[PDB]
Design an enzyme around this catalytic site. Structure first.
Site, PDB file in Angstrom:
ATOM      1  N   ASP A   1       0.639  -0.891  -0.605  1.00 22.51           N
ATOM      2  CA  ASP A   1       0.189   0.387  -0.104  1.00 22.51           C
ATOM      3  C   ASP A   1       0.583   0.922   0.052  1.00 22.51           C
ATOM      4  OD1 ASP A   1      -2.070   1.873   0.162  1.00 22.51           O
ATOM      5  OD2 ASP A   1      -2.886   1.008   2.409  1.00 22.51           O
ATOM      6  N   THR A   2       1.295   2.209  -0.843  1.00 15.92           N
ATOM      7  CA  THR A   2       1.892   2.969  -0.967  1.00 15.92           C
ATOM      8  C   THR A   2       1.162   3.905  -0.793  1.00 15.92           C
ATOM      9  OG1 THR A   2       1.033   3.953  -3.105  1.00 15.92           O
ATOM     10  CG2 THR A   2       3.215   2.237  -3.435  1.00 15.92           C
ATOM     11  N   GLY A   3       0.275   4.365  -0.528  1.00 14.39           N
ATOM     12  CA  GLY A   3      -0.363   5.536  -0.204  1.00 14.39           C
ATOM     13  C   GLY A   3      -0.634   5.049   1.597  1.00 14.39           C
TER      14      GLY A   3
HETATM   15  C1  LIG Z   1      -8.549  -1.102   2.170  1.00 17.01           C
HETATM   16  C2  LIG Z   1      -6.850  -0.806   2.134  1.00 17.01           C
HETATM   17  C3  LIG Z   1      -6.386   0.919   1.900  1.00 17.01           C
HETATM   18  C4  LIG Z   1      -7.024   1.326   3.515  1.00 17.01           C
HETATM   19  C5  LIG Z   1      -6.022   1.125   4.793  1.00 17.01           C
HETATM   20  C6  LIG Z   1      -7.425   1.381   1.299  1.00 17.01           C
HETATM   21  N1  LIG Z   1      -6.839   3.249   1.243  1.00 17.01           N
HETATM   22  C7  LIG Z   1      -6.005   3.726   0.202  1.00 17.01           C
HETATM   23  C8  LIG Z   1      -4.606   3.886   1.492  1.00 17.01           C
HETATM   24  O1  LIG Z   1      -3.301   4.138   0.353  1.00 17.01           O
HETATM   25  C9  LIG Z   1      -5.011   5.100   1.651  1.00 17.01           C
HETATM   26  C10 LIG Z   1      -4.894   6.290   1.136  1.00 17.01           C
HETATM   27  C11 LIG Z   1      -5.035   7.775   2.175  1.00 17.01           C
HETATM   28  C12 LIG Z   1      -3.557   8.230   2.760  1.00 17.01           C
HETATM   29  C13 LIG Z   1      -3.925   9.662   3.239  1.00 17.01           C
HETATM   30  C14 LIG Z   1      -5.154  10.176   4.151  1.00 17.01           C
HETATM   31  C15 LIG Z   1      -6.741   8.886   4.199  1.00 17.01           C
HETATM   32  C16 LIG Z   1      -6.330   7.860   2.696  1.00 17.01           C
HETATM   33  N2  LIG Z   1      -4.368   5.031   3.050  1.00 17.01           N
HETATM   34  C17 LIG Z   1      -4.356   5.020   4.642  1.00 17.01           C
HETATM   35  O2  LIG Z   1      -5.313   4.883   5.246  1.00 17.01           O
HETATM   36  O3  LIG Z   1      -2.961   4.999   5.894  1.00 17.01           O
HETATM   37  C18 LIG Z   1      -3.357   4.917   6.590  1.00 17.01           C
HETATM   38  C19 LIG Z   1      -2.517   4.266   7.481  1.00 17.01           C
HETATM   39  O4  LIG Z   1      -0.610   5.406   7.411  1.00 17.01           O
HETATM   40  C20 LIG Z   1      -1.407   6.309   7.876  1.00 17.01           C
HETATM   41  O5  LIG Z   1      -0.488   6.889   6.382  1.00 17.01           O
HETATM   42  C21 LIG Z   1      -2.135   7.477   5.211  1.00 17.01           C
HETATM   43  C22 LIG Z   1      -3.136   7.636   6.520  1.00 17.01           C
HETATM   44  C23 LIG Z   1      -2.510   6.324   7.354  1.00 17.01           C
HETATM   45  S1  LIG Z   1      -8.438   4.491   0.812  1.00 17.01           S
HETATM   46  O6  LIG Z   1      -8.305   5.873   0.269  1.00 17.01           O
HETATM   47  O7  LIG Z   1      -9.684   4.363   2.055  1.00 17.01           O
HETATM   48  C24 LIG Z   1      -9.762   4.146  -0.517  1.00 17.01           C
HETATM   49  C25 LIG Z   1      -9.296   4.131  -1.896  1.00 17.01           C
HETATM   50  C26 LIG Z   1      -9.817   3.351  -3.200  1.00 17.01           C
HETATM   51  C27 LIG Z   1     -11.289   2.641  -2.780  1.00 17.01           C
HETATM   52  O8  LIG Z   1     -11.617   2.287  -3.857  1.00 17.01           O
HETATM   53  C28 LIG Z   1     -12.540   1.234  -3.742  1.00 17.01           C
HETATM   54  C29 LIG Z   1     -11.289   2.194  -1.423  1.00 17.01           C
HETATM   55  C30 LIG Z   1     -10.449   2.884   0.142  1.00 17.01           C
END
Ligand SMILES: CCC(CC)CN(C[C@@H](O)[C@H](Cc1ccccc1)NC(=O)O[C@H]1CO[C@H]2OCC[C@H]21)S(=O)(=O)c1ccc(OC)cc1
EC number: 3.4.23.16
Lengths: 99, 99
Positions: A25-27
């Protein structure tokens, strides 16, 4: 390996001596795993995502092998929708994005 | 190019005639963008992550340019804290994970 993205980049990890499946998960800044038992001390922490903030238990300096590559770093445990490997560990295994 | 993950993988995108910064996010199935008043029809959708679900507007067949790489596909618009480019578009620009 080179991993294409037509499917979710799911891989097997080993943590606490147990095998699990997790999402590369690069995000995600941080690595967050679903509720599990891990040995050693932990600290309560908050982490925020797209839908708000959750309470997690923070385990520091945890050994974790990701797709055959070893990392040692912070692992958050709590009600995440799925196990995610974040950048704190992706950097350790030498993972980059390429296009 | 090659993007390391020491910091958030933010890139410039062009959509709806606007330039924005967005994450190249291998953990996102779909692309989710900050509130913007795009023209055309849309369908309601709910997407879930850490913290729970948010309501978004699904727009189909939207043109989007990512680091000069053109793509066209579904974009979700809603109160997300960050713009994320999901796998639906990352595959269209030839993006892989490599370690
Ligand atoms: C279900 C896996 C994952 C949640 C874990 C999904 N996410 C993408 C992540 O990359 C989000 C993308 C994201 C990044 C930043 C803020 C909100 C969302 N990152 C995230 O939540 O990371 C958290 C954990 O590490 C911390 O750094 C970022 C926040 C913390 S998301 O943003 O909620 C998401 C994106 C598209 C989608 O389409 C169906 C459904 C959900």
């Amino acid at each position: 390996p080179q991993i294409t993205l037509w499917k979710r980049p799911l891989v097997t990890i080993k943590i606490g001596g147990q095998l699990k499946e997790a999402l590369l998960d690069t995000g995600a800044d941080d690595t967050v795993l679903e509720e599990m038992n891990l040995p050693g001390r932990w600290k309560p922490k908050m982490i925020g995502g797209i839908g708000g903030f959750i309470k997690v238990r923070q385990y520091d300096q945890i050994l974790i092998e990701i797709c055959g590559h070893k990392a040692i770093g912070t692992v958050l445990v709590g009600p995440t929708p799925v196990n995610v490997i974040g950048r704190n560990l992706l950097t350790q295994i030498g993972c980059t994005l390429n296009f």
